[PDB]
Amino acid sequence: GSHLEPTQLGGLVTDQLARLCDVARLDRTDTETYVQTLATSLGTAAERSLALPPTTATLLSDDHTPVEYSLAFLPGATPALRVLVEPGWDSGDLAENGRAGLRAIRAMADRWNFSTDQLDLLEDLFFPVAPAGPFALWCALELRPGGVPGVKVYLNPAARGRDRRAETLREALDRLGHRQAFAALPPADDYPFLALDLGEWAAPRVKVYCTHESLSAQEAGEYSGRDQTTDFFHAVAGTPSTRRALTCHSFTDTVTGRPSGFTLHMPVRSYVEHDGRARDRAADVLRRYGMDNDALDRALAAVTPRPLDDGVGLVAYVALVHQLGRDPRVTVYVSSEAYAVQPPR
């Protein structure tokens, strides 16, 4: 059973996650495992009444829920389910938020027997005494069949102040042995996140994110499958020749200085009037790639029964993922809306 009730934040998000586990065709026991894992990772946030304000006005989601879901679609396959969480959200300030986040990661490392050495190497860069925003630590769990998840950690290059974003990023890459990786990154307006794959992965990466305030379709294809990426840009943007977007650049070896993965993240919630339009664009991309567009509709209804045209931001992002030696993947990011539905434009 669950100690959580539907009036508590943890009750709403574990109910959402359980329904999503069924879309992802996870069995009863893996579902129970991951539902409990989500509640544990939230700490005291799980038990917080939804009637109270969000403890932290977090960047993780627009309404400041410390949870976001995502579905990774491969051609011909049922989608893989992942969840992003902020373990330290129910903390009083950013320093304590980070401490609780690292504590949660250490607990996961103990339970699933993986090392935190690589993350440990970076602690002074990303967890200084008086940290700057906008966040301290997020964790993403890939909810794999079998109950042992894939673990990723997200860190803030601006932790030591905005003026040291590139200094921090570059020092982190050097410490990890990726001394040529920075040179492979495109021009950018921000370096909002650095992510690390923890534990078991066929090729664990460091992932560097770049914000582009005014990206064109041509630039997106250049930074990437040029044609695939430009087509995806137009499809999600509804194209108006530049849009806000993020690129992610994945490095899985320290030898060449070349990335092994590229992702274009399009914030479709910023481009459309309501989630009816965003679902339409996501469904069309999935369908055209031979992916499981029916499962997208089932996932949206698993999260919320509201009509899609009654708000915007349920479909937060649609992303096109290229990884050398794998088929393209499309990821749809889906909001919890535990605190607010953003009204349609």
Ligand X SMILES: CC(C)=CCSP(=O)(O)OP(=O)(O)O
Q: Which residues bind ligand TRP (CB under 6 A)?
A: 59-61, 68, 246, 265, 316-317, 333
Q: Which is nearer to ligand X, 72 or 235 (CB)?
A: 72
80, 20 contact by CB (below 8 A)? no
Q: β-strand 242-251 against 80-85: which pairing, if any?
A: unpaired
- Residue 90 corresponds to which tokens in the numbers above? 């129910």
Q: Which is nearer to ligand X, 72 or 81 (CB)?
A: 72
Of 148-167, which residues contact ligand X (CB under 6 A)?
A: 152, 154
Closest approach of ligand X to the CB of residue 132, in Å: 18
First to last CA, the chain: 41
Under the binding rule (CB under 6 A), the answer on residue 274 touching ligand X is no
Eight-class DSSP state of 275: H
Short-list 189, 108, 95, 98, CA closest to 142: 108
Closest approach of ligand TRP to the CB of residue 243, in Å: 14
Q: β-strand 194-198 against 329-335: which pairing, if any?
A: unpaired
Closest approach of ligand X to the CB of residue 334, in Å: 12
Of 63-82, which residues contact ligand X (CB under 6 A)?
A: 70, 72
Q: Which is nearer to ligand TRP, 70 or 116 (CB)?
A: 70
Distance of alpha carbon 305 from alpha carbon 209, whole angstroms:
33
Distance of alpha carbon 173 from alpha carbon 241, whole angstroms:
33
Count of residues of this chain found to bind ligand X when the rule CB under 6 A is applied: 11
- Residue 54 corresponds to which tokens in the numbers above? 């969000």
303 contacts which partner out of ligand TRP, ligand X, none, CB within 5 to 8 A by kind?
Answer: none
308 contacts which partner out of ligand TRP, ligand X, none, CB within 5 to 8 A by kind?
Answer: none
16 contacts which partner out of ligand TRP, ligand X, none, CB within 5 to 8 A by kind?
Answer: none
Amino acid at 222: E
Characterize 85-94 residue by residue with b for buried, 16 or more Cβ atoms within 10 angstroms of its Cβ, and e for exposed. bbbbbbbeeb
Amino acid at 330: V
Distance of alpha carbon 152 from alpha carbon 142, whole angstroms:
8
Under the binding rule (CB under 6 A), the answer on residue 84 touching ligand X is yes
Q: Which is nearer to ligand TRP, 4 or 210 (CB)?
A: 210
Q: Which is nearer to ligand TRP, 262 or 317 (CB)?
A: 317
Under the binding rule (CB under 6 A), the answer on residue 321 touching ligand X is yes
Residues of the shown chain interacting with ligand X in the complex, contacts defined by CB under 6 A: 70, 72, 84, 140, 152, 154, 193, 195, 248, 321, 331
